[PDB]
Amino acid sequence: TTTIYMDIGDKKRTKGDFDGAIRAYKKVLKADPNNVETLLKLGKTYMDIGLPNDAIESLKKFVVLDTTSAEAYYILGSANFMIDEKQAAIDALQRAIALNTVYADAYYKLGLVYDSMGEHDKAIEAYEKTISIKPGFIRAYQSIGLAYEGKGLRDEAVKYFKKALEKEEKKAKYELALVPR
């Protein structure tokens, strides 16, 4: 029953029928409002269609019931940044990271949030952690550069902008298909 409607929702979501998927998950939640698996799926469905404000309604209920999912916190904090709730974003992303200390997406997002607030040194710390986990992630070097510009340290900024370029300098010369297809 929970099972039957959750399956309908999953299959509708896969098919791109996001209104149907939401209907099915809502039906699950009418009967079983504390179904955390459904709360996370309804949240994710709303994120898929670019409605973080609706997603957060489900993800808030999820974390009341379950404080153990790094992903839920990541999505909640990401959504909070989308809706201009930056301290709630930080709080959630911190929770995600505390739950998974190698969660590169969370550290990158946390850095984006801090830099948006003018918190350039906190941002650099989070981006540095991002690069320690995924040293091939080019935009993190760019983002570090921007944070240094934010501090008025243009020489350090240009050092990181150049680091970003250096990551693909071999490919740019020695391969043929560079530009997006």
Contacts of 145 (CB under 8 A, 6+ apart): 157, 158, 159, 160, 161, 163, 164
φ, ψ for residue 151 (rounded to 5)? -80, -5
Resolution as reported, in Å: 1.8
Amino acid at 146: L
**Could you tell me how far CA 10 lies from the centroid of its own chain?**
22
> Which of 65, 60, 121, 120 lies closest to 91, judged by CA?
60
Long-range interactions of 137-141: CB distance < 8 A, separation 24+: 137/104, 137/108, 138/164, 138/167, 138/168, 139/164, 140/108, 140/111, 141/167
What is the Cα 40 distance to its own chain's centre? Answer: 14
Residues 130 and 108 sit within 8 Å (Cβ to Cβ): yes
Whole-number Cα distances in Å, 143 to 11, 52, 71, 158: 38, 24, 23, 11
Structure tokens at 11: 């299959």
Q: What angle do CA 172, 178, 181 make, to 5 degrees?
A: 175
Give me 13's structure tokens. 């979501």
How many CB atoms within 10 Å of residue 54? Answer: 17
Distance separating alpha carbons of residues 15 and 13, to the nearest angstrom: 5
Name the amino acid, one letter, at 20. G
Question: Over the Cα atoms of the chain, what is R_g?
Answer: 20
Could you give the CA distance from residue 87 to residue 117 in angstroms, rounded to a whole number? 10
Q: What are phi and psi of 7, to 5 degrees?
A: -60, -45
Query: 117 and 85 in contact (C-beta within 8 Å)?
Result: no
**Per-residue CA distances from 53 to 58, 82, 152 (Å):** 10, 8, 35
Structural domains in the chain plus CATH codes: 1-181 (1.25.40.10)
Burial class, 129, CB count within 10 angstroms (exposed 0-12 / middle 13-18 / buried 19+): buried
Spatial CB neighbours of 129, under 8 Å, sequence gap ≥ 6 = 104, 107
For residue 112, the one-letter residue type is L
Distance CA 28, CA 5 (A): 6
- Report the C-alpha gap between 59 and 66 in whole angstroms: 10
Helix, strand, coil % in the chain, rounded to nearest 5: 80, 0, 20
